[PDB]
Amino acid sequence: SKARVYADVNVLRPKEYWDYEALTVQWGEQDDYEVVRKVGRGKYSEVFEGINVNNNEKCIIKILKPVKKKKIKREIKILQNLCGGPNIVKLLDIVRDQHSKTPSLIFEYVNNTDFKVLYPTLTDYDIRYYIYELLKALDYCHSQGIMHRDVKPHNVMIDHELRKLRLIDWGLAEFYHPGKEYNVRVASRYFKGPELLVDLQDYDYSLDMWSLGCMFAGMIFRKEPFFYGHDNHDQLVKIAKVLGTDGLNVYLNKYRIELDPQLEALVGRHSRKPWLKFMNADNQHLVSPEAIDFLDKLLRYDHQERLTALEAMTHPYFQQVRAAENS
Ligand SMILES: Cc1c(Br)c(=O)oc2c(Br)c(O)ccc12
Questions:
Q1: Do 202 and 81 belong to one domain?
Q2: How far is the CA of 267 from the centre of ligand 1 (A)?
Q3: Which of UniProt's keywords are assigned here?
Q4: Are residues 298 and 216 both part of a single domain?
């Protein structure tokens, strides 16, 4: 398998672009930036509202937990590579604590609203608008030879008052190289593509489009997460109970994949559940044929069959957003 688009980006670029292991960090000044308040945390970092003491402007201070030097250079290089692109979070500085050498990544400040509280309030149009803003970031990063690999609401910072959106946490992101076999232990379970769940390792940018599809299904159906598996085998089963097993079988044989016996038995055999079966009185106001058509074209087992971020942006679902822009 190769990517259908942007496959040669890294081939054509100087090795310095994608050789993140050869990065030597230029450390800035740790006391330029003071923690004001914690705003988030995860397996790999803690994140604070901060202040730049020089100019008294807000910032975001992402303090990294102990991890391999490689994974740190990866995220930095990716961030520097994408700095300036549409709706991609801006890395302003990199610093460390002299004594312990714990890295902090310093970012533009974004004033997020938790999605679990924000998304209920989003109107039909809002959803079109923000998903389009997120597609800008994705087309940009793919165009630059990079896969996010962890698209999910938690990694999409939205300032609803200013209607500004940023794609955050490039910690799992990777450079796309034709043919390369990647670690499938990426993304977060509910947003993992079937490729990851069936150990197809030569995946690409398309992985992020599945993830996007999962996020989008959750928003329009008000069912978050959309695919709610308890473990990775169950994640595939939950998908197969919606997309049906035939599509799965076509897919497995195309890429010559054999499901280990236990998974194959868990998945079973299921007919397809049409997207309209998810509409109800909680979500009706957000379900439209254009939404469903767009969704349908994202959630495909075959990653080669999914819309590219470029393609998705032109889907008629987004036409008012696009027209609003072109004026
Ligand atoms: C702006 C921002 C926020 Br707000 C956050 O909670 O996490 C972030 C992470 Br994790 C990043 O990696 C970059 C920016 C942010």
A1: no
A2: 36
A3: ATP-binding, Kinase, Nucleotide-binding, Serine/threonine-protein kinase, Transferase
A4: yes
